[PDB]
Amino acid sequence: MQVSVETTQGLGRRVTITIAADSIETAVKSELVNVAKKVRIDGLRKGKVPMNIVAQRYGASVRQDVLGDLMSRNFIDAIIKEKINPAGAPTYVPGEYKLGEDFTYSVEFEVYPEVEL
Numbered sequence: 001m002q003v004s005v006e007t008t009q010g011l012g013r014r015v016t017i018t019i020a021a022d023s024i025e026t027a028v029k030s031e032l033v034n035v036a037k038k039v040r041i042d043g044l045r046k047g048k049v050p051m052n053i054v055a056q057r058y059g060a061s062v063r064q065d066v067l068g069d070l071m072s073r074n075f076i077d078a079i080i081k082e083k084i085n086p087a088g089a090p091t092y093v094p095g096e097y098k099l100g101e102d103f104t105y106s107v108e109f110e111v112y113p114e115v116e117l
Contacts, residue, residue, distance in 0.1 A: 001102060003078045011087070011110040015078055018104045019070050025100070027066040028059075035062060067097065075107050087112040 002018035036054045040046040071092060079086065090109035097103050 002104075003074075003082070005082055005084065008108065011112065012108065013084065013111055014106050014108045015075060015082070015084070016104065016106045017071075017074050017078055018102050019067075019074060021100055021102045024063075024066060024070065024103065027070065028063050031062045031066060032058065067103065071105055085111060 001020040001023070002016075004016040006014040006016065008014050032051070032054055035058050036049055036051065037047045039049045039054060041049050041053075071094070075090070075092075078084075086109035088109070090107045093106045093108060095104040095106070
């Protein structure tokens with residue numbers, strides 16, 4: 001929902017990204033549908049499990065999965081878009097996550113010299 005680049009100091013940069021609360025819930029909801037298909041209660045048909053039960057058992061873990069996925073997925077799209085190239089492994093600095101609310105986080109890294117002449 002929002003991508004901002006900042007210069008920290010020297011070759012240092014910081015990419016701040018906001019993921020829409022809506023994008024999160026939509027992803028959580030769809031991954032839960034996929035999880036349901038892998039679940040088998042007793043000897044009953046696989047995928048035959050109440051949604052509310054799937055939510056109770058896997059809801060939190062799926063939410064953790066979606067946020068991590070979106071955090072890196074969006075960061076990578078962002079640096080491609082902004083044509084910014086990190087030196088080494090960037091540092092993720094998560095913001096405070098609040099259920100049913102937009103999520104903001106930052107990624108810090110140094111840029112580097114391209115081959116010249």
